[PDB]
PDB file of C-alpha atoms in Angstrom:
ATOM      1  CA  UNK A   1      88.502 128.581 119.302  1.00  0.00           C
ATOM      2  CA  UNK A   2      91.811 127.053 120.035  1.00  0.00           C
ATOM      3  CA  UNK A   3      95.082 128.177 118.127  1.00  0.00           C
ATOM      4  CA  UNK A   4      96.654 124.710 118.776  1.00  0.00           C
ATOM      5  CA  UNK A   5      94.839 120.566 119.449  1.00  0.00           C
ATOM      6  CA  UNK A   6      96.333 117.184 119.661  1.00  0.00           C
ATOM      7  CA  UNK A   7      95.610 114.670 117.788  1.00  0.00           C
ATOM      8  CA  UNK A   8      93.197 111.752 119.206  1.00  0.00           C
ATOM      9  CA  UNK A   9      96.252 109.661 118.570  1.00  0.00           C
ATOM     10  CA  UNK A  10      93.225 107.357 116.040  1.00  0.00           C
ATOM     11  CA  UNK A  11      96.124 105.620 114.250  1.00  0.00           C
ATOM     12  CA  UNK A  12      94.586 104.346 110.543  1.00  0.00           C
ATOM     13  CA  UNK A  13      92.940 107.213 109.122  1.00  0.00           C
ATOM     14  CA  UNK A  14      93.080 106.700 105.254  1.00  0.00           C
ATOM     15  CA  UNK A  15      90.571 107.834 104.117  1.00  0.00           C
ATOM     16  CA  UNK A  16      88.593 110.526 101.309  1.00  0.00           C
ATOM     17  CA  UNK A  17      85.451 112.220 100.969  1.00  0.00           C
ATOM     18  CA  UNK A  18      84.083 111.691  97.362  1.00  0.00           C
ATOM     19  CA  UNK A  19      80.379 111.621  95.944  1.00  0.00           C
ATOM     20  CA  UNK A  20      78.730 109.062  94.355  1.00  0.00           C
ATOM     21  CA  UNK A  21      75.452 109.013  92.698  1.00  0.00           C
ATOM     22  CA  UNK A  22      73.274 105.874  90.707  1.00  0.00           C
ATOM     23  CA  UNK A  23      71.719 105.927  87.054  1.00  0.00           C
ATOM     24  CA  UNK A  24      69.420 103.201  87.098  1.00  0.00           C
ATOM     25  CA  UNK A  25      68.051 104.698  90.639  1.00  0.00           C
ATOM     26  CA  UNK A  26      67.170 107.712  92.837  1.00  0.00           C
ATOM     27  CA  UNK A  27      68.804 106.514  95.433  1.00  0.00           C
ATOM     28  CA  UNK A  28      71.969 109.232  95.748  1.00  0.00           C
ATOM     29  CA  UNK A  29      74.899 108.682  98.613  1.00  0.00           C
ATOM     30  CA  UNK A  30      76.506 112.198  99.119  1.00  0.00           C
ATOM     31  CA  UNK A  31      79.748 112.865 101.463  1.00  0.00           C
ATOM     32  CA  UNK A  32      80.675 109.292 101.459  1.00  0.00           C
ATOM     33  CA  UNK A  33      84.321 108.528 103.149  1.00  0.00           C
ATOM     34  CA  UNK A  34      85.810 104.970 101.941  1.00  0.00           C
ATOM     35  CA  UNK A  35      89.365 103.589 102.857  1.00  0.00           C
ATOM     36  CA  UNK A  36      91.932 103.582 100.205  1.00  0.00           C
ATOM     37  CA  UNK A  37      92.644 100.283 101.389  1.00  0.00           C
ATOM     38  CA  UNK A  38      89.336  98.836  99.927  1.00  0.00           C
ATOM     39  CA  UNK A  39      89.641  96.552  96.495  1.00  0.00           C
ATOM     40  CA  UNK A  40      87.820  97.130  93.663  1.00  0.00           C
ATOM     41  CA  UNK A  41      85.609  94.204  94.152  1.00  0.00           C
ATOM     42  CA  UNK A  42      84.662  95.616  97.700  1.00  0.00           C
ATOM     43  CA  UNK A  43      84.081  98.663  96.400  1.00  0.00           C
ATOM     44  CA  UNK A  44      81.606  97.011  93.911  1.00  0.00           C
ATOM     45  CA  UNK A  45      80.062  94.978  96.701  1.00  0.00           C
ATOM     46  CA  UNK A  46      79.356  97.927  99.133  1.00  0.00           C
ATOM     47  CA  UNK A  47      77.597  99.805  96.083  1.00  0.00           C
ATOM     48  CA  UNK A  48      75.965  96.819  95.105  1.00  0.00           C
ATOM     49  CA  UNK A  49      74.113  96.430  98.633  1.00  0.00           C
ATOM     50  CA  UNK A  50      73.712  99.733  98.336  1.00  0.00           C
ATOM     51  CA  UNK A  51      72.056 100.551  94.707  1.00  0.00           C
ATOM     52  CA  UNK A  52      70.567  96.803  95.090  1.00  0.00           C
ATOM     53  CA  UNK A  53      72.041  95.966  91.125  1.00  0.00           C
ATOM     54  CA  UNK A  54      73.981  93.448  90.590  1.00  0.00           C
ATOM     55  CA  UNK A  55      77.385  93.550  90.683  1.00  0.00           C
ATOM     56  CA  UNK A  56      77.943  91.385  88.118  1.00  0.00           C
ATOM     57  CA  UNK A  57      76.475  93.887  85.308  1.00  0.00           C
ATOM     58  CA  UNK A  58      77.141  96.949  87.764  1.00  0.00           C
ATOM     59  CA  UNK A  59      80.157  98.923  86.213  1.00  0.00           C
ATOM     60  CA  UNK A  60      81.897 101.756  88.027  1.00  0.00           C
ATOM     61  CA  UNK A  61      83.649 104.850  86.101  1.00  0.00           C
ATOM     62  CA  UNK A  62      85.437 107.748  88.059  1.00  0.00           C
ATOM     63  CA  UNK A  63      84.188 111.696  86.766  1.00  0.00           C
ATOM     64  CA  UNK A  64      85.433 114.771  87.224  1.00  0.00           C
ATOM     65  CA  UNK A  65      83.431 117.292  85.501  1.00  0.00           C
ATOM     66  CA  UNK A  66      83.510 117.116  81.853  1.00  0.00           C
ATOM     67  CA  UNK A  67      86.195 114.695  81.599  1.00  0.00           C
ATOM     68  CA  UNK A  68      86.086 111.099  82.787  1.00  0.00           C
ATOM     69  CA  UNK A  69      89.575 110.673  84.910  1.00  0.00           C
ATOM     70  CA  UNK A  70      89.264 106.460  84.152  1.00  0.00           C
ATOM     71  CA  UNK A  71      87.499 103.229  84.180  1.00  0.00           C
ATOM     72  CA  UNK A  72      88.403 100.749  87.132  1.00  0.00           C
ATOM     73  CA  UNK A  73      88.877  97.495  84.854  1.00  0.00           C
ATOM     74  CA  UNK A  74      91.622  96.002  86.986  1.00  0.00           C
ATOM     75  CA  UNK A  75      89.687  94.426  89.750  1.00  0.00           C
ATOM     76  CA  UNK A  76      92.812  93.902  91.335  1.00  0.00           C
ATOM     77  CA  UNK A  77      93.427  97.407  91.522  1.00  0.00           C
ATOM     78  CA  UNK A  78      93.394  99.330  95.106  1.00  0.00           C
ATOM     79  CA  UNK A  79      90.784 102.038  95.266  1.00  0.00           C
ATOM     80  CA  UNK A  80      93.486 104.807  96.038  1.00  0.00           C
ATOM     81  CA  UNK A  81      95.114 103.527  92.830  1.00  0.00           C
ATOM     82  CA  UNK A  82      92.255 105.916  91.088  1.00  0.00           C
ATOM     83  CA  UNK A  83      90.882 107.994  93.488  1.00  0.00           C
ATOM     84  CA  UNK A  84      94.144 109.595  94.970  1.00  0.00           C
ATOM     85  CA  UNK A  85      92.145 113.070  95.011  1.00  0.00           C
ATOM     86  CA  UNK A  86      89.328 114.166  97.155  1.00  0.00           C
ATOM     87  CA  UNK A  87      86.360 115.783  95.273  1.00  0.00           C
ATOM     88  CA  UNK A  88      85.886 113.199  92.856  1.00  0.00           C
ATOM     89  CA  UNK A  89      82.653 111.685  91.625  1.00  0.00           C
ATOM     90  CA  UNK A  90      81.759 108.384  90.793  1.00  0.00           C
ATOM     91  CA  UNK A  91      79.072 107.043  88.708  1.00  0.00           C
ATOM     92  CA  UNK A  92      77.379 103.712  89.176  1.00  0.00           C
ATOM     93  CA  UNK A  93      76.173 102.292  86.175  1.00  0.00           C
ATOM     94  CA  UNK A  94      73.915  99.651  86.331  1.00  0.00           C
ATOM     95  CA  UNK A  95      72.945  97.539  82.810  1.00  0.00           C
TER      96      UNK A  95
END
């Protein structure tokens, strides 16, 4: 169905596909697309609306299977500083 498109000439388009799931609560977000752009702090406040915790005791780790890849503990760190790679999983934790 087409060989060949154009692009929709969009412009920003930063962005990756990741999952992220909650301990402390069943409520799951799966193919979630967030701009590399976005802080650490943002990050933390668009999961806190969304898991309802507070973001003040809600930590956030990255995972990729066995191994954990790191811990965002520089809030002044970009999200694509971590997650530079698609197909990663993050884990809220809420406590």
């Amino acid at each position: 169905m087409g060989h060949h498109h154009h692009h929709h000439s969009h412009g920003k388009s930063d962005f990756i596909k990741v999952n992220v799931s909650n301990s402390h609560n069943d409520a799951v977000a799966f193919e979630v697309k967030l701009a590399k752009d976005l802080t650490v702090a943002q990050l933390k406040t668009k999961l806190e609306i969304l898991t309802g915790g507070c973001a003040g005791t809600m930590k956030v780790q990255v995972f990729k299977g066995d191994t954990c890849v790191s811990t965002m503990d520089n809030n002044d760190a970009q999200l694509g500083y971590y997650a530079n790679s698609d197909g990663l999983r993050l884990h809220v934790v809420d406590s």
